[PDB]
Amino acid sequence: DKFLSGVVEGFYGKPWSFEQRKTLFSNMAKWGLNTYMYGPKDDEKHRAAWKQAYSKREGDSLRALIRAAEESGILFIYAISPGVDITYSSNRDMKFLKDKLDQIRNFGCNSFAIFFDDIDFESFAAAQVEVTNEIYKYLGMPANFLFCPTEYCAARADPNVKESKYLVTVGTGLHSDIHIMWTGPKVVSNKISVESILELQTVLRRKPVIWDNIHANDYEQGRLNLGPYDCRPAELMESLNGIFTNPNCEFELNYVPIRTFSLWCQSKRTRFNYDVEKALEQSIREWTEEFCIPRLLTVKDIRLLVELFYLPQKHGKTANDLLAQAKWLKSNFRIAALNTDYIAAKEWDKRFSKFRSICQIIHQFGDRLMTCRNRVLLYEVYNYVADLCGILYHLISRIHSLANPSFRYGGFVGDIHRLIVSTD
Amino acid sequence: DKFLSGVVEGFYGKPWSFEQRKTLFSNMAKWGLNTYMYGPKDDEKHRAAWKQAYSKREGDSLRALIRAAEESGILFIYAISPGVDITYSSNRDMKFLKDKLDQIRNFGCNSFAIFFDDIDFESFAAAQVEVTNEIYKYLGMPANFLFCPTEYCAARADPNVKESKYLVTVGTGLHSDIHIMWTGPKVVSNKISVESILELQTVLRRKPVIWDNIHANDYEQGRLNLGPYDCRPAELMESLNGIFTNPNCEFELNYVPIRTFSLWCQSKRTRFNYDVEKALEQSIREWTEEFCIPRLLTVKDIRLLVELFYLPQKHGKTANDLLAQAKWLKSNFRIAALNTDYIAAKEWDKRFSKFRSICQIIHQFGDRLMTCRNRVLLYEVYNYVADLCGILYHLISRIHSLANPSFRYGGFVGDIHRLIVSTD
């Protein structure tokens, strides 16, 4: 039990394929991080079909996945969410849990993760502690046994944030060799700090394991998190028993965030210094080297793509420059189509022609990305660039319509978005 | 040369697989429409690599695709876009065009479609007419030879809309057995009429073929067009030489628009009456019958899904009801948290609880759709429902925050969207 630094499949919608998970395991071996939790929402065998057992074909597929993870040199953690209605009462569903963990142990893996409310009331705390301790005693002593609480973030703890008493019950009543999952101050989890982890270490009397969601994208329309691993210090890695991350739903776009997270873990095993921009440019150089592979573009344009679709907490340099220029063209547009007023209109036309040149070069980047060698990495990235070029052309057309003397975009989702931004 | 009613691949990004095109051909055989134009943007052999030839493996794949279309009972039209810089001048690139059409004729197909500006200046009209007539004379007399002009819509004709003189040059100079592509009054092409097609038949002195884009979705973020085929009369089908349609980028979502278009063509071959709602409920019943297939939910919830992601020209009944209720809750929110004012606040709370019940039942529809048998049709539809549930919960949270005493969504695309809706 050294450190459980890995990548989960806690996102919704996409099942990653067997070769995608195999290349993920080989990337895990060559990068340094040594864990992989298996919680896919497409696989409903561990979520609601745990009363049922595993079949022959999907059992052999999971056995091949487990032995592929074993031969790659990483470890496999099977996350099963039966629900918070066990309470050790009837023990028929506890027998179903024991038979399910027996057949997963027959499939090859020995590490588990009991989930009650999966990270995306009352009188359940001591019952879930008893259920988790009886399951952990039934499996003897597994080396890496995880447990996700119902109040996995400070926004979900309803009595205050220090002592909601559910965290103190699962801190005192559970066995000391079981890890507790956590997310941070928020479920979306932007700008986390070591003080919340320190008071959680005070409450839980053990080091937790941070399920992170700084690269997750299932909760927003068109969000892509190709940004680096930022706003987490090295001492946050120091005061834990491991830290997982939830990447994007599309696998081939997750080269740069998993590589910056691998820098953030494996270089910090030796020395606690971390440069975000150096790891970002190293990951983007390795991503251009992976971009040239013809699996069925210079570094500057892919730097522009990474700096556009950044983290949810902060945009990139180019994105902030475009938002500042769009705000400047939107604010002082009354001097348009009109000595000092005429040169101010010429300055406004200079800024607007700079904006048109930015949309033209990002459309040329879209065509040059369309002429790529890799195609399965092309399709996962093309929709974001195409919709960005469309909304940037709509922005430029709106500014040009406001220059000289409705708007439907996004369908119903964009209609709801415009209905909650526009005021009375 | 009866009628070229078919489905194109003119969308961007997605290459449809061989089995997807095979099931598309079997659906084409069992529904009635008998054409398929091949213009995929992922295949750059016909767009810029037409100087190069076809390889052995992709040539055998195209030969298998052509013979699969032949054995299904439909016909195959190969669309090639060399560019508008031919002008019959050097004839080396004309020899490249002749060798490319020779190897496509060796692959099996005999129908073609010369494109100059693909539907998504000056002094080119008589040169492109000469190039198209020399190519059509080189191929003898193909039965179905198509030609897409540069000014394919009335919004692209720069001198007026009746006589831009490019349309009159390609109407008089071309051979009378060549069809001319058209889109309508707009490239996006909503609410088209028979009068524009009548004046185009006056100008072009032949019946055109309408490339339609009423179900296209590559040009907007999160747009899904699961709506029926609407706002096109039967006499529009009467005064043509065929009509194609551009469906969505995801293949398995295109059951209902291609089935309503198949109703709109094949039932109108016998009688020109068309019910939009009867064809919509027949296509949604056949889509539930296809929904139950376990290829790796009652009719009311899939009716709710189709009525949500409707056409770009008009929303459904449920979507208009939700927008009207959101506008009503947004408009008179000042009576909230406050005799007549108190019962008005209770009426406001009744409408807000109705809105919360609508978001709850659409999240339950999301979970019940997640428990489906088909998975490759699950993943193509899950992202739209998940982002709709997220933006509806954000709408309800904003209305509840406005009830009793920034906003980041979409990333950079949503930032541009909020920057072009919000005013000074």
Numbering used by the authors:
A (entry chain B), B (entry chain A): 4 to 123, 134 to 309, 352 to 393, 410 to 476, 489 to 507
Quoted passage from the original study:
Nucleocytoplasmic protein O-GlcNAcylation is a dynamic modification catalysed by O-GlcNAc transferase (OGT) and reversed by O-GlcNAc hydrolase (OGA), whose activities are regulated through largely unknown O-GlcNAc-dependent feedback mechanisms. OGA is a homodimeric, multi-domain enzyme containing a catalytic core and a pseudo-histone acetyltransferase (pHAT) domain. Here, we show that the eukaryotic OGA pHAT domain forms catalytically incompetent, symmetric homodimers, projecting a partially conserved putative peptide-binding site. In solution, OGA exist as flexible multi-domain dimers, but catalytic core-pHAT linker interactions restrict pHAT positional range.
To determine the spatial arrangement of the pHAT domains relative to the catalytic core, the full-length TaOGA structure was solved by cryo-EM. Initial 2D classification revealed a well-defined homodimeric catalytic core but lacked clear density for the pHAT domains. Subsequent 3D reconstruction produced a map resolving the TaOGA homodimeric catalytic and stalk domains at 3.0 Å resolution, into which an AlphaFold3 model guided model building. The dimerisation interface of TaOGA buries 2700 Å2 of the total 20,000 Å2 surface area, accounting for 14%, as calculated by the PISA server, which is 20% smaller than the reported value for the hOGA crystal structures. The interface is largely conserved, differing at only a few residues, and forms a broad solvent-exposed hollow channel through the homodimer. The top of the stalk domains of this TaOGA cryo-EM structure are in the same tight arrangement as in the hOGA catalytic core crystal structures, whereas one of the TaOGA catalytic domains rotates away from the neighbouring stalk domain, which is reflected in a pairwise inter-Cα distance of 33 Å in TaOGA (Lys59) and 40 Å in hOGA (Val113). The absence of visible pHAT domains in 2D classifications and 3D reconstruction suggests substantial flexibility between the catalytic core and pHAT domains, despite the presence of a short linker (STDEYEESTLKNS) connecting them. Notably, several negative charges in the linker may contribute to electrostatic repulsion of these regions in the homodimer. Taken together, these data suggest that TaOGA, like hOGA, is a homodimer with dimerisation interfaces for the catalytic cores and pHAT domains, although the latter are averaged out due to the flexible linkers under conditions of the cryo-EM experiment. Notably, the linker connecting the catalytic core and the pHAT domain is smaller in TaOGA and not conserved between the two organisms, likely weakening the interaction between the catalytic core and the pHAT domains, resulting in no observed density for the pHAT domains in the cryo-EM structure of TaOGA.
